[PDB]
mmCIF file of C-alpha atoms and ligand atoms in Angstrom:
data_model
loop_
_atom_site.group_PDB
_atom_site.id
_atom_site.type_symbol
_atom_site.label_atom_id
_atom_site.label_comp_id
_atom_site.label_asym_id
_atom_site.label_seq_id
_atom_site.Cartn_x
_atom_site.Cartn_y
_atom_site.Cartn_z
ATOM 1 C CA UNK A 1 -20.274 -13.211 14.795
ATOM 2 C CA UNK A 2 -21.522 -10.273 16.900
ATOM 3 C CA UNK A 3 -19.351 -7.273 17.795
ATOM 4 C CA UNK A 4 -18.350 -7.165 21.515
ATOM 5 C CA UNK A 5 -18.840 -4.001 23.547
ATOM 6 C CA UNK A 6 -15.003 -4.092 24.101
ATOM 7 C CA UNK A 7 -14.240 -3.873 20.358
ATOM 8 C CA UNK A 8 -16.568 -0.815 20.113
ATOM 9 C CA UNK A 9 -15.164 0.981 23.213
ATOM 10 C CA UNK A 10 -11.563 0.568 21.907
ATOM 11 C CA UNK A 11 -12.591 2.518 18.777
ATOM 12 C CA UNK A 12 -14.668 5.032 20.775
ATOM 13 C CA UNK A 13 -11.736 6.026 23.087
ATOM 14 C CA UNK A 14 -9.517 7.153 20.177
ATOM 15 C CA UNK A 15 -9.141 10.933 20.392
ATOM 16 C CA UNK A 16 -7.675 11.808 16.940
ATOM 17 C CA UNK A 17 -5.740 14.666 18.553
ATOM 18 C CA UNK A 18 -3.630 16.674 16.012
ATOM 19 C CA UNK A 19 -5.668 15.480 12.951
ATOM 20 C CA UNK A 20 -8.211 17.032 10.547
ATOM 21 C CA UNK A 21 -9.866 14.060 8.735
ATOM 22 C CA UNK A 22 -11.848 16.347 6.391
ATOM 23 C CA UNK A 23 -8.674 17.904 4.803
ATOM 24 C CA UNK A 24 -7.168 16.985 1.355
ATOM 25 C CA UNK A 25 -3.679 16.756 2.961
ATOM 26 C CA UNK A 26 -4.730 14.442 5.840
ATOM 27 C CA UNK A 27 -1.886 11.948 6.419
ATOM 28 C CA UNK A 28 -3.214 8.445 7.184
ATOM 29 C CA UNK A 29 0.372 7.097 7.569
ATOM 30 C CA UNK A 30 1.143 9.647 10.372
ATOM 31 C CA UNK A 31 -2.227 8.727 11.997
ATOM 32 C CA UNK A 32 -1.218 5.033 12.050
ATOM 33 C CA UNK A 33 2.308 5.460 13.542
ATOM 34 C CA UNK A 34 1.118 7.908 16.305
ATOM 35 C CA UNK A 35 -0.602 4.992 18.197
ATOM 36 C CA UNK A 36 0.114 1.342 19.049
ATOM 37 C CA UNK A 37 -3.551 0.624 18.007
ATOM 38 C CA UNK A 38 -3.486 1.776 14.349
ATOM 39 C CA UNK A 39 -6.461 -0.491 13.402
ATOM 40 C CA UNK A 40 -8.595 1.191 16.066
ATOM 41 C CA UNK A 41 -7.469 4.622 14.878
ATOM 42 C CA UNK A 42 -8.356 3.688 11.304
ATOM 43 C CA UNK A 43 -11.821 2.562 12.464
ATOM 44 C CA UNK A 44 -12.336 5.765 14.451
ATOM 45 C CA UNK A 45 -11.443 7.873 11.411
ATOM 46 C CA UNK A 46 -14.211 6.154 9.381
ATOM 47 C CA UNK A 47 -16.646 6.398 12.286
ATOM 48 C CA UNK A 48 -16.015 10.130 12.829
ATOM 49 C CA UNK A 49 -16.124 10.941 9.094
ATOM 50 C CA UNK A 50 -19.421 9.136 8.732
ATOM 51 C CA UNK A 51 -21.083 10.514 11.894
ATOM 52 C CA UNK A 52 -19.619 13.981 11.302
ATOM 53 C CA UNK A 53 -21.234 14.103 7.879
ATOM 54 C CA UNK A 54 -24.775 13.974 9.262
ATOM 55 C CA UNK A 55 -25.630 11.301 6.644
ATOM 56 C CA UNK A 56 -26.229 8.173 8.839
ATOM 57 C CA UNK A 57 -28.615 10.133 11.113
ATOM 58 C CA UNK A 58 -30.617 11.308 8.075
ATOM 59 C CA UNK A 59 -31.046 7.705 6.917
ATOM 60 C CA UNK A 60 -32.006 6.113 10.198
ATOM 61 C CA UNK A 61 -28.624 4.459 10.856
ATOM 62 C CA UNK A 62 -27.852 4.544 14.548
ATOM 63 C CA UNK A 63 -24.329 5.159 15.933
ATOM 64 C CA UNK A 64 -24.158 1.590 17.133
ATOM 65 C CA UNK A 65 -25.172 0.059 13.795
ATOM 66 C CA UNK A 66 -22.576 2.218 12.002
ATOM 67 C CA UNK A 67 -19.816 1.197 14.328
ATOM 68 C CA UNK A 68 -20.791 -2.462 14.090
ATOM 69 C CA UNK A 69 -20.726 -2.183 10.290
ATOM 70 C CA UNK A 70 -17.241 -0.602 10.304
ATOM 71 C CA UNK A 71 -15.941 -3.361 12.594
ATOM 72 C CA UNK A 72 -17.450 -6.171 10.502
ATOM 73 C CA UNK A 73 -15.732 -4.629 7.429
ATOM 74 C CA UNK A 74 -12.467 -4.397 9.394
ATOM 75 C CA UNK A 75 -12.583 -8.148 10.370
ATOM 76 C CA UNK A 76 -12.712 -9.102 6.658
ATOM 77 C CA UNK A 77 -9.609 -7.144 5.550
ATOM 78 C CA UNK A 78 -6.358 -9.075 5.579
ATOM 79 C CA UNK A 79 -2.763 -8.411 6.599
ATOM 80 C CA UNK A 80 -1.513 -7.531 3.101
ATOM 81 C CA UNK A 81 0.797 -4.609 2.184
ATOM 82 C CA UNK A 82 -1.731 -2.482 0.261
ATOM 83 C CA UNK A 83 -5.346 -3.800 -0.161
ATOM 84 C CA UNK A 84 -6.003 -3.708 3.579
ATOM 85 C CA UNK A 85 -8.256 -1.784 5.957
ATOM 86 C CA UNK A 86 -6.059 1.339 5.703
ATOM 87 C CA UNK A 87 -6.601 1.479 1.969
ATOM 88 C CA UNK A 88 -10.369 1.481 2.243
ATOM 89 C CA UNK A 89 -10.376 3.986 5.045
ATOM 90 C CA UNK A 90 -8.146 6.122 2.832
ATOM 91 C CA UNK A 91 -10.602 5.743 -0.087
ATOM 92 C CA UNK A 92 -13.513 6.698 2.188
ATOM 93 C CA UNK A 93 -11.656 9.793 3.443
ATOM 94 C CA UNK A 94 -10.551 10.771 -0.054
ATOM 95 C CA UNK A 95 -14.101 10.438 -1.446
ATOM 96 C CA UNK A 96 -15.308 12.562 1.437
ATOM 97 C CA UNK A 97 -12.877 15.286 0.305
ATOM 98 C CA UNK A 98 -13.994 14.940 -3.329
ATOM 99 C CA UNK A 99 -17.612 15.348 -2.317
ATOM 100 C CA UNK A 100 -17.235 18.185 0.200
ATOM 101 C CA UNK A 101 -14.009 20.090 -0.794
ATOM 102 C CA UNK A 102 -14.397 19.303 -4.480
ATOM 103 C CA UNK A 103 -18.130 20.014 -4.261
ATOM 104 C CA UNK A 104 -19.165 16.842 -6.027
ATOM 105 C CA UNK A 105 -22.097 16.725 -3.481
ATOM 106 C CA UNK A 106 -23.675 19.192 -5.947
ATOM 107 C CA UNK A 107 -24.093 16.399 -8.506
ATOM 108 C CA UNK A 108 -25.442 13.736 -6.147
ATOM 109 C CA UNK A 109 -28.240 13.321 -3.617
ATOM 110 C CA UNK A 110 -27.409 12.940 0.088
ATOM 111 C CA UNK A 111 -28.419 9.289 -0.120
ATOM 112 C CA UNK A 112 -25.913 8.721 -2.925
ATOM 113 C CA UNK A 113 -23.187 10.446 -0.866
ATOM 114 C CA UNK A 114 -23.974 8.140 2.121
ATOM 115 C CA UNK A 115 -23.899 5.105 -0.152
ATOM 116 C CA UNK A 116 -20.537 6.130 -1.625
ATOM 117 C CA UNK A 117 -18.911 6.656 1.742
ATOM 118 C CA UNK A 118 -20.203 3.215 2.899
ATOM 119 C CA UNK A 119 -19.218 1.552 -0.361
ATOM 120 C CA UNK A 120 -15.648 2.735 0.045
ATOM 121 C CA UNK A 121 -15.383 0.557 3.154
ATOM 122 C CA UNK A 122 -16.682 -2.644 1.473
ATOM 123 C CA UNK A 123 -15.052 -2.219 -1.922
ATOM 124 C CA UNK A 124 -12.054 -4.573 -1.399
ATOM 125 C CA UNK A 125 -13.416 -6.914 1.308
ATOM 126 C CA UNK A 126 -11.160 -9.975 1.792
ATOM 127 C CA UNK A 127 -8.607 -8.893 -0.843
ATOM 128 C CA UNK A 128 -5.577 -11.241 -0.705
ATOM 129 C CA UNK A 129 -3.056 -9.088 -2.548
ATOM 130 C CA UNK A 130 -3.633 -10.893 -5.857
ATOM 131 C CA UNK A 131 -5.324 -9.430 -8.870
ATOM 132 C CA UNK A 132 -7.971 -10.859 -11.203
ATOM 133 C CA UNK A 133 -5.346 -12.097 -13.670
ATOM 134 C CA UNK A 134 -3.724 -14.291 -11.069
ATOM 135 C CA UNK A 135 -6.984 -16.173 -10.481
ATOM 136 C CA UNK A 136 -7.846 -16.586 -14.156
ATOM 137 C CA UNK A 137 -4.309 -17.614 -15.267
ATOM 138 C CA UNK A 138 -3.780 -20.173 -12.458
ATOM 139 C CA UNK A 139 -7.239 -21.771 -12.871
ATOM 140 C CA UNK A 140 -7.713 -21.347 -9.106
ATOM 141 C CA UNK A 141 -11.135 -22.242 -7.664
ATOM 142 C CA UNK A 142 -12.350 -18.584 -7.794
ATOM 143 C CA UNK A 143 -11.107 -18.235 -11.391
ATOM 144 C CA UNK A 144 -13.051 -21.330 -12.442
ATOM 145 C CA UNK A 145 -16.135 -20.072 -10.653
ATOM 146 C CA UNK A 146 -16.023 -16.723 -12.493
ATOM 147 C CA UNK A 147 -15.465 -18.305 -15.831
ATOM 148 C CA UNK A 148 -18.314 -20.812 -15.374
ATOM 149 C CA UNK A 149 -20.688 -18.112 -14.038
ATOM 150 C CA UNK A 150 -20.006 -15.423 -16.739
ATOM 151 C CA UNK A 151 -18.229 -12.429 -15.119
ATOM 152 C CA UNK A 152 -14.412 -11.959 -15.392
ATOM 153 C CA UNK A 153 -14.261 -9.452 -12.439
ATOM 154 C CA UNK A 154 -13.379 -12.224 -9.989
ATOM 155 C CA UNK A 155 -12.505 -10.095 -6.967
ATOM 156 C CA UNK A 156 -15.116 -7.362 -7.376
ATOM 157 C CA UNK A 157 -17.926 -9.969 -7.369
ATOM 158 C CA UNK A 158 -16.313 -11.533 -4.297
ATOM 159 C CA UNK A 159 -16.246 -8.141 -2.508
ATOM 160 C CA UNK A 160 -19.927 -7.446 -3.347
ATOM 161 C CA UNK A 161 -20.898 -10.883 -1.941
ATOM 162 C CA UNK A 162 -19.219 -10.167 1.375
ATOM 163 C CA UNK A 163 -20.726 -6.700 1.487
ATOM 164 C CA UNK A 164 -24.185 -8.190 1.042
ATOM 165 C CA UNK A 165 -23.494 -10.746 3.783
ATOM 166 C CA UNK A 166 -22.481 -7.984 6.222
ATOM 167 C CA UNK A 167 -25.570 -5.933 5.372
ATOM 168 C CA UNK A 168 -27.979 -8.908 5.719
ATOM 169 C CA UNK A 169 -27.541 -8.738 9.532
ATOM 170 C CA UNK A 170 -29.724 -5.827 10.933
ATOM 171 C CA UNK A 171 -27.180 -5.028 13.657
ATOM 172 C CA UNK A 172 -24.646 -4.027 10.936
ATOM 173 C CA UNK A 173 -27.069 -2.965 8.157
ATOM 174 C CA UNK A 174 -26.403 0.733 7.638
ATOM 175 C CA UNK A 175 -29.239 0.727 5.054
ATOM 176 C CA UNK A 176 -31.924 -0.702 7.493
ATOM 177 C CA UNK A 177 -33.584 2.716 7.887
ATOM 178 C CA UNK A 178 -34.335 2.831 4.118
ATOM 179 C CA UNK A 179 -37.272 1.154 2.375
ATOM 180 C CA UNK A 180 -38.652 0.541 -1.045
ATOM 181 C CA UNK A 181 -36.947 2.279 -3.931
ATOM 182 C CA UNK A 182 -34.381 3.927 -1.655
ATOM 183 C CA UNK A 183 -33.207 0.639 -0.195
ATOM 184 C CA UNK A 184 -33.028 -0.848 -3.733
ATOM 185 C CA UNK A 185 -31.022 2.133 -5.015
ATOM 186 C CA UNK A 186 -28.586 1.745 -2.094
ATOM 187 C CA UNK A 187 -27.805 -1.889 -2.922
ATOM 188 C CA UNK A 188 -27.845 -1.544 -6.667
ATOM 189 C CA UNK A 189 -25.587 1.540 -6.613
ATOM 190 C CA UNK A 190 -23.158 -0.025 -4.092
ATOM 191 C CA UNK A 191 -22.788 -3.117 -6.261
ATOM 192 C CA UNK A 192 -22.391 -1.150 -9.510
ATOM 193 C CA UNK A 193 -19.702 1.036 -7.893
ATOM 194 C CA UNK A 194 -17.747 -1.934 -6.648
ATOM 195 C CA UNK A 195 -18.015 -3.781 -9.937
ATOM 196 C CA UNK A 196 -16.819 -0.587 -11.669
ATOM 197 C CA UNK A 197 -13.500 -0.717 -9.751
ATOM 198 C CA UNK A 198 -12.175 -3.544 -12.012
ATOM 199 C CA UNK A 199 -9.428 -1.893 -14.039
ATOM 200 C CA UNK A 200 -10.255 -4.012 -17.105
ATOM 201 C CA UNK A 201 -13.431 -1.857 -17.326
ATOM 202 C CA UNK A 202 -11.586 1.472 -16.830
ATOM 203 C CA UNK A 203 -11.850 2.907 -20.366
ATOM 204 C CA UNK A 204 -15.469 1.778 -20.760
ATOM 205 C CA UNK A 205 -16.481 3.319 -17.468
ATOM 206 C CA UNK A 206 -14.744 6.576 -18.343
ATOM 207 C CA UNK A 207 -16.242 6.755 -21.873
ATOM 208 C CA UNK A 208 -19.719 6.048 -20.467
ATOM 209 C CA UNK A 209 -19.341 8.772 -17.841
ATOM 210 C CA UNK A 210 -18.087 11.317 -20.403
ATOM 211 C CA UNK A 211 -20.849 10.488 -22.917
ATOM 212 C CA UNK A 212 -23.458 10.798 -20.182
ATOM 213 C CA UNK A 213 -21.998 14.142 -19.011
ATOM 214 C CA UNK A 214 -22.018 15.615 -22.549
ATOM 215 C CA UNK A 215 -25.672 14.661 -22.954
ATOM 216 C CA UNK A 216 -28.108 17.167 -21.324
ATOM 217 C CA UNK A 217 -30.978 14.650 -21.743
ATOM 218 C CA UNK A 218 -29.002 11.910 -19.991
ATOM 219 C CA UNK A 219 -31.157 9.555 -17.937
ATOM 220 C CA UNK A 220 -30.719 11.361 -14.575
ATOM 221 C CA UNK A 221 -30.570 8.134 -12.580
ATOM 222 C CA UNK A 222 -27.898 6.710 -14.892
ATOM 223 C CA UNK A 223 -25.838 9.955 -14.839
ATOM 224 C CA UNK A 224 -25.983 9.950 -11.010
ATOM 225 C CA UNK A 225 -24.965 6.320 -10.981
ATOM 226 C CA UNK A 226 -22.096 6.939 -13.406
ATOM 227 C CA UNK A 227 -20.946 9.783 -11.252
ATOM 228 C CA UNK A 228 -20.899 7.425 -8.236
ATOM 229 C CA UNK A 229 -18.891 4.848 -10.166
ATOM 230 C CA UNK A 230 -16.412 7.474 -11.301
ATOM 231 C CA UNK A 231 -15.995 8.926 -7.801
ATOM 232 C CA UNK A 232 -15.304 5.471 -6.325
ATOM 233 C CA UNK A 233 -12.910 4.845 -9.209
ATOM 234 C CA UNK A 234 -11.247 8.234 -8.539
ATOM 235 C CA UNK A 235 -10.828 7.436 -4.830
ATOM 236 C CA UNK A 236 -9.383 4.044 -5.676
ATOM 237 C CA UNK A 237 -6.582 5.524 -7.859
ATOM 238 C CA UNK A 238 -6.281 8.726 -5.789
ATOM 239 C CA UNK A 239 -2.824 7.933 -4.366
ATOM 240 C CA UNK A 240 -1.222 10.017 -7.147
ATOM 241 C CA UNK A 241 -3.355 13.060 -6.070
ATOM 242 C CA UNK A 242 -1.822 13.152 -2.627
ATOM 243 C CA UNK A 243 1.227 15.031 -1.214
ATOM 244 C CA UNK A 244 4.234 13.361 -2.707
ATOM 245 C CA UNK A 245 5.491 11.587 0.400
ATOM 246 C CA UNK A 246 2.046 10.068 1.018
ATOM 247 C CA UNK A 247 1.751 9.103 -2.663
ATOM 248 C CA UNK A 248 5.158 7.441 -2.588
ATOM 249 C CA UNK A 249 4.317 5.319 0.523
ATOM 250 C CA UNK A 250 1.213 3.917 -1.166
ATOM 251 C CA UNK A 251 3.230 3.231 -4.308
ATOM 252 C CA UNK A 252 5.870 1.271 -2.240
ATOM 253 C CA UNK A 253 3.109 -0.791 -0.658
ATOM 254 C CA UNK A 254 1.354 -1.661 -3.918
ATOM 255 C CA UNK A 255 4.689 -2.537 -5.511
ATOM 256 C CA UNK A 256 5.408 -5.046 -2.709
ATOM 257 C CA UNK A 257 2.002 -6.744 -3.479
ATOM 258 C CA UNK A 258 2.876 -6.955 -7.126
ATOM 259 C CA UNK A 259 6.174 -8.650 -6.251
ATOM 260 C CA UNK A 260 4.540 -11.175 -3.926
ATOM 261 C CA UNK A 261 2.039 -12.047 -6.691
ATOM 262 C CA UNK A 262 4.901 -12.482 -9.110
ATOM 263 C CA UNK A 263 6.729 -14.825 -6.690
ATOM 264 C CA UNK A 264 3.544 -16.883 -6.369
ATOM 265 C CA UNK A 265 3.098 -16.822 -10.162
ATOM 266 C CA UNK A 266 6.727 -17.994 -10.763
ATOM 267 C CA UNK A 267 6.393 -20.897 -8.364
ATOM 268 C CA UNK A 268 3.065 -21.942 -10.069
ATOM 269 C CA UNK A 269 4.778 -21.911 -13.462
ATOM 270 C CA UNK A 270 2.718 -19.065 -14.935
ATOM 271 C CA UNK A 271 3.653 -15.942 -16.846
ATOM 272 C CA UNK A 272 4.818 -12.917 -14.854
ATOM 273 C CA UNK A 273 4.528 -9.389 -16.231
ATOM 274 C CA UNK A 274 7.870 -7.603 -15.601
ATOM 275 C CA UNK A 275 6.247 -5.039 -13.266
ATOM 276 C CA UNK A 276 5.454 -8.053 -10.952
ATOM 277 C CA UNK A 277 8.998 -9.455 -11.175
ATOM 278 C CA UNK A 278 11.128 -8.939 -8.043
ATOM 279 C CA UNK A 279 14.278 -10.194 -9.818
ATOM 280 C CA UNK A 280 13.899 -7.712 -12.712
ATOM 281 C CA UNK A 281 14.074 -4.850 -10.196
ATOM 282 C CA UNK A 282 12.226 -1.855 -11.628
ATOM 283 C CA UNK A 283 12.175 1.841 -10.760
ATOM 284 C CA UNK A 284 9.274 3.047 -8.648
ATOM 285 C CA UNK A 285 9.456 6.341 -10.548
ATOM 286 C CA UNK A 286 8.966 4.891 -14.085
ATOM 287 C CA UNK A 287 5.949 2.892 -12.878
ATOM 288 C CA UNK A 288 4.353 5.960 -11.285
ATOM 289 C CA UNK A 289 5.095 8.145 -14.268
ATOM 290 C CA UNK A 290 3.647 5.371 -16.517
ATOM 291 C CA UNK A 291 0.457 5.107 -14.490
ATOM 292 C CA UNK A 292 0.107 8.867 -14.379
ATOM 293 C CA UNK A 293 0.571 9.355 -18.136
ATOM 294 C CA UNK A 294 -1.568 6.508 -19.360
ATOM 295 C CA UNK A 295 -4.281 6.224 -16.662
ATOM 296 C CA UNK A 296 -4.544 8.868 -13.950
ATOM 297 C CA UNK A 297 -3.731 12.217 -15.617
ATOM 298 C CA UNK A 298 -6.204 11.747 -18.515
ATOM 299 C CA UNK A 299 -8.797 10.304 -16.173
ATOM 300 C CA UNK A 300 -8.723 13.151 -13.691
ATOM 301 C CA UNK A 301 -8.241 15.873 -16.355
ATOM 302 C CA UNK A 302 -11.213 14.515 -18.312
ATOM 303 C CA UNK A 303 -13.656 14.152 -15.425
ATOM 304 C CA UNK A 304 -12.683 17.625 -14.186
ATOM 305 C CA UNK A 305 -13.108 19.218 -17.654
ATOM 306 C CA UNK A 306 -16.352 17.281 -18.327
ATOM 307 C CA UNK A 307 -18.183 18.244 -15.117
ATOM 308 C CA UNK A 308 -16.158 18.031 -11.846
ATOM 309 C CA UNK A 309 -14.532 21.528 -11.920
ATOM 310 C CA UNK A 310 -14.107 21.546 -8.152
ATOM 311 C CA UNK A 311 -11.702 18.622 -8.303
ATOM 312 C CA UNK A 312 -9.113 20.751 -10.186
ATOM 313 C CA UNK A 313 -6.539 20.290 -7.362
ATOM 314 C CA UNK A 314 -6.252 16.593 -8.289
ATOM 315 C CA UNK A 315 -4.889 17.465 -11.754
ATOM 316 C CA UNK A 316 -2.490 20.034 -10.223
ATOM 317 C CA UNK A 317 -1.234 17.571 -7.684
ATOM 318 C CA UNK A 318 -0.781 14.813 -10.280
ATOM 319 C CA UNK A 319 1.203 17.240 -12.426
ATOM 320 C CA UNK A 320 3.518 18.090 -9.507
ATOM 321 C CA UNK A 321 3.972 14.507 -8.320
ATOM 322 C CA UNK A 322 4.848 13.534 -11.858
ATOM 323 C CA UNK A 323 7.508 16.297 -12.082
ATOM 324 C CA UNK A 324 8.914 15.107 -8.785
ATOM 325 C CA UNK A 325 9.205 11.508 -10.108
ATOM 326 C CA UNK A 326 10.761 12.873 -13.255
ATOM 327 C CA UNK A 327 13.455 14.589 -11.069
ATOM 328 C CA UNK A 328 14.054 11.343 -9.188
ATOM 329 C CA UNK A 329 14.894 9.892 -12.618
ATOM 330 C CA UNK A 330 16.890 12.891 -13.935
ATOM 331 C CA UNK A 331 19.213 12.942 -10.915
ATOM 332 C CA UNK A 332 19.869 9.190 -10.753
HETATM 333 MG MG1 LIG B 401 -10.381 -3.691 -5.937
HETATM 334 ZN ZN1 LIG B 402 -9.315 -0.546 -3.830
#
């Protein structure tokens, strides 16, 4: 279904007036509420980041093809509290700051940077606010399909499929200007990055990245790839690296998705983890502190110590968000 000229022009008119999209403290929530067309603003942020980078022009992607691509991604995100178009635009923006303020561009080629920024926008296509466990535990059609076809990353495979479908049309194929090994690397690296977002693979992905970083004779291609996976992973859990108020808003939104899954799980007669249980009302702060201590702090501290020195601010910001959550608890 082609993109109208009207859909494009609506995005193209957006000014972005009091906003620096390149900055680590960019506030997507304030961008949304400053317009009655927040979905067009979101699209314009992605469009301007991408064009502003110089990367699409280097790889033969025209302005029009880029914008069509962004709009075809947008059509496939749903009206869910968290895993929506704003999330992926946020991940794109955040990865941009990791590459260009955190200087991770030093570890990757320009092609890999372009692929990562594009991959951010496809990485949760058609998410329905339900995680992989829901599908496997309820024996839903997608769960059965995954089980029968091998791979337990139900959603990530689904997202890759839709990404491939979008890119198979030349009018939205941001990789159309590539050929041969470069076009293959684009698709293979996109898919690997998206598959690496499944949190069941978190420890394995991290170990593999760290082992590959410690090894000076690492297969360069595989180290580059690992770096891409880790950067998409970092963007995906980057809410805790943001100014506290921004971090808190994302945490409220994800929590609402967890509760809606738990409602759906209860009414299907399946097991509900207490974090998903609306009626066993839980403290936002303990959940954030839990995530920080067991997942995010070691992840970001390790990748920074191992090789990504320029992303030091992420560790500092996690440390200060954690302390703030700890004071929310201490004063209750
Ligand atoms: Mg995902
Ligand atoms: Zn995501």
